[PDB]
Scaffold this active site. Structure first.
Site, PDB file in Angstrom:
ATOM      1  N   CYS D 106     -94.395 -12.731  36.772  1.00 40.64           N
ATOM      2  CA  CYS D 106     -95.465 -13.235  36.408  1.00 40.64           C
ATOM      3  C   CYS D 106     -95.286 -14.683  36.246  1.00 40.64           C
ATOM      4  CB  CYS D 106     -96.138 -12.578  35.115  1.00 40.64           C
ATOM      5  SG  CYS D 106     -97.780 -12.823  34.154  1.00 40.64           S
ATOM      6  N   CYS D 109     -97.321 -16.008  32.773  1.00 41.34           N
ATOM      7  CA  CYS D 109     -97.046 -15.720  31.423  1.00 41.34           C
ATOM      8  C   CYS D 109     -95.666 -14.539  31.490  1.00 41.34           C
ATOM      9  CB  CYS D 109     -98.272 -14.986  30.882  1.00 41.34           C
ATOM     10  SG  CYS D 109     -99.517 -14.198  31.824  1.00 41.34           S
ATOM     11  N   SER D 110     -96.180 -13.273  31.682  1.00 41.97           N
ATOM     12  CA  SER D 110     -95.059 -12.266  31.697  1.00 41.97           C
ATOM     13  C   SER D 110     -95.830 -10.834  31.882  1.00 41.97           C
ATOM     14  CB  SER D 110     -94.304 -12.124  30.444  1.00 41.97           C
ATOM     15  OG  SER D 110     -95.386 -11.826  29.280  1.00 41.97           O
ATOM     16  N   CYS D 111     -97.005 -10.958  32.592  1.00 46.19           N
ATOM     17  CA  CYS D 111     -97.777  -9.652  32.926  1.00 46.19           C
ATOM     18  C   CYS D 111     -96.845  -8.681  33.517  1.00 46.19           C
ATOM     19  CB  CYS D 111     -98.858  -9.880  33.555  1.00 46.19           C
ATOM     20  SG  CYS D 111    -100.042 -11.191  32.894  1.00 46.19           S
TER      21      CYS D 111
END
Ligand SMILES: [Co+2]
Ligand SMILES: [Co+2]
Lengths: 229, 203, 229, 203
Positions: D106, D109-111
């Site tokens: 991701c 972001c950090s999905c």
């Protein structure tokens, strides 16, 4: 490299801290004035830096957090140290101990030493400059007025090919001649001259928006490629 | 913390301590003298300044022949005037007109023609200006108080090579009668960068 | 926006701090655990945030230095505060005073209060989720297998169109259906559904280097455009 | 300093103080309860974990029909197993083969699919991995100790939408004879992200 220094086109950096020129002070601290000397002093003698190519890469290699936090002259300090270590002029452990020492007692005075000999060298550099112009036998690929296309390449090392103009069409405005190629000189791989061109880009081509704005930039022949038919 | 080193930036004191550490080391090893370090500070803090470019603008504002010579072969003209030197070896002068406006920048670092305008402004080397001036020059100019019509083309010049650029502003509609030396006094540093226009001495 | 969060393709961030999964701890501090609750708690009730679109923009709006320095859960805190202020749920001065208070005496205890009613709401969200799938009457423009071209646009507000894939050619791999459009929902402009597609890109097209690598990404129809002939 | 505010980052204590300030304010105003804030911590720190995805991999590793159902219509299959929830509403399972390797990320972001693998790794949300994995996945994989031949295609999956992806690794050549529950024990979290391969239980 696609580093934090290549900020062209980014958002989020906020408003410009405009200040009147009669109030915008050059150096606020003494170490900043010192840094300028340190930089100009080494480059004049070719200590760790022949020209500005090796100088800019040193800054680009900083850690993103250090680049945004340290002051402007903090960048200069980082590169001077980087280059002096790399070229072995100074030893790693040697510099670390001094740094720590001065952080312990910042008031420590330094032994003053002088000699007009070096001073004369520094003046030579400041007044004669370091023109990157060279002579080559190659025939330039493009000509003024020709429609060009920047290449889609992402060099890992130093390069003066900002991301906001990659893989975009433009027009040659001028043929300056051959100049030292940053991508090589910065890494001590030999200043391999290449024809330098000034290319004009339209706002629409760069940002996808029709506005009466345009950007002019200088690109080395190695960044450009002919328009396919 | 141990897995998040990049989250912590070195303190401002570190850089200061590093500069001193460098100074002593270079001196101690007899690689750099103290009188050489001072020669430079003196030269960039008291010898060079925007005053140089101001004279060039004033002379071109009063001598059509000089102006032409300046716009065609700027490198030669400047060399004769003596405004040559480190980071000022190759300079191009872009002229502002009623339909064209010029603004210079160095998105990658902060390249500026020292021998001509002296050291750059503080905001000129910061990310805010460098990042936005090439994508939306009109907004950036408003922040400086310069509102340009949409009929006026804005040309942004990014100093990607060793080549430097200087902006030649238009002569205000309030002068006339003033001398060269008197005109050099009204040309501002910002007007030669393209973020402002010389205001008429009328008021 | 072309912010610091869109790091795809950048250099200079160094090596990966790899750690064994059996040693990689989730929360090191109590305030981090608290933040997770704070985030999940508000979104479940629609306080300042209906879904994750309004949540991501809050982070993207942070100052670059804060984004790189604050921890991961620091980002979550910034957006929750951003959204609660924006939607007027909390007053600016009101929050500032509390923050300062807790910086003065961090040991200050908080009045505990409970009610299974909200707890039941939070569980509903955690188990049912917030599917962004919607129904529209529009006819999708592209089909699986079709060769596409991402548009060259630079939105100022939120967008899930990373810079490393703009103005590049790709191939549609799947047509998911219509999903909430981030660019609008994030700014409270209405979740205006748009067909979502998974596009495949070749390393050569993205980085100008022939390698046996490829990137798959999901793009909204509003980011794509048909290939001219 | 006064013209360089962006050079100074807020201290880590500020964020901590802010979270507490938020907690008290929301509670004081009766907008959020304390037992609700705990329900969440308990659910993401003690209820969800990579163990869920591990069972899916083990079942597919032993049931060709399940595997097919899983790869064709993953959303339905997962819903029946009960591995559904916030940030896990739409999931796709990509399979690794002798000629194809998958790795998810991701970049923005950090999905991550919480309902399936629990919270993401610390390095997964940091800039280093997110920036490099899409441009030079091979180098990044070496850092994790995974050296892939050039004949093996590497597919990077960037989670730009709410859609999440999970990697289905190949069954090690040392198993055979082991049961489903016994196989679920060897599937690592990293193997379901694509940064590692399940090592053979032989040794
Ligand atoms: Co520069
Ligand atoms: Co994410």
């Amino acid at each position: 490299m696609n580093g934090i220094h290549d900020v062209g086109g980014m958002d989020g950096f906020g408003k410009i801290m405009y200040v009147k020129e009669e109030e915008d002070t050059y150096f606020k601290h003494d170490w900043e004035r010192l840094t300028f000397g340190l930089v100009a002093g080494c480059m004049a003698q070719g200590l760790g830096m022949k020209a500005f190519d090796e100088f800019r890469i040193g800054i680009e290699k900083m850690r993103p957090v250090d680049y945004l936090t340290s002051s402007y002259y903090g960048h200069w300090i980082a590169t001077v140290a980087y280059n002096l270590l790399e070229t072995g002029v100074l030893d790693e452990k040697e510099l670390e101990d001094r740094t720590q020492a001065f952080m312990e007692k910042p008031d420590t005075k330094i032994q003053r030493w002088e000699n007009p000999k070096l001073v004369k060298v520094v003046e030579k550099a400041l007044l004669e400059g370091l023109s990157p112009v060279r002579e080559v036998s190659s025939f330039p690929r493009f000509e003024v007025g020709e429609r060009i296309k920047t290449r889609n390449i992402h060099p890992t090392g130093h390069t003066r090919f900002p991301r906001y103009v990659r893989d975009k069409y433009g027009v040659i405005e001028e043929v300056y001649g051959a100049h030292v190629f940053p991508d090589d000189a910065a890494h001590r791989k030999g200043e391999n001259p290449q024809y330098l061109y000034r290319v004009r880009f339209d706002a629409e081509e760069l940002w996808g928006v029709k506005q009466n704005d345009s950007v002019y930039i200088d690109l080395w022949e190695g960044y450009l490629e002919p328009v396919s038919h | 913390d141990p897995r998040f080193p990049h989250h912590h930036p070195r303190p401002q004191s570190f850089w200061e301590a590093r500069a001193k550490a460098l100074e002593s080391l270079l001196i101690e090893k007899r690689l750099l003298s103290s009188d050489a370090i001072e020669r430079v500070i003196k030269h960039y803090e008291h010898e060079l300044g925007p005053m140089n470019g101001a004279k060039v603008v004033a002379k071109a504002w009063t001598d059509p022949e000089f102006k032409q010579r300046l716009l065609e072969d700027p490198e030669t003209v400047l060399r004769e005037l003596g405004y040559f030197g480190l980071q000022g070896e190759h300079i191009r002068v872009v002229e502002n007109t009623d339909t064209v406006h010029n603004v210079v920048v160095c998105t990658l670092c902060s390249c500026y023609p020292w021998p001509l305008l002296g050291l750059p402004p503080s905001w000129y080397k910061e990310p805010a200006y460098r990042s936005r001036v090439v994508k939306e020059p009109r907004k950036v100019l408003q922040e400086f108080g310069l509102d340009l019509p949409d009929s006026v083309e804005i040309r942004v010049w990014d100093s990607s090579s060793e080549v430097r650029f200087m902006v030649l502003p238009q002569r205000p509609e309030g002068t006339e009668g003033m001398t060269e030396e008197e005109l050099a006094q009204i040309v501002t540093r910002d007007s030669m960068i393209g973020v402002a226009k010389v205001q008429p001495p009328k008021v």
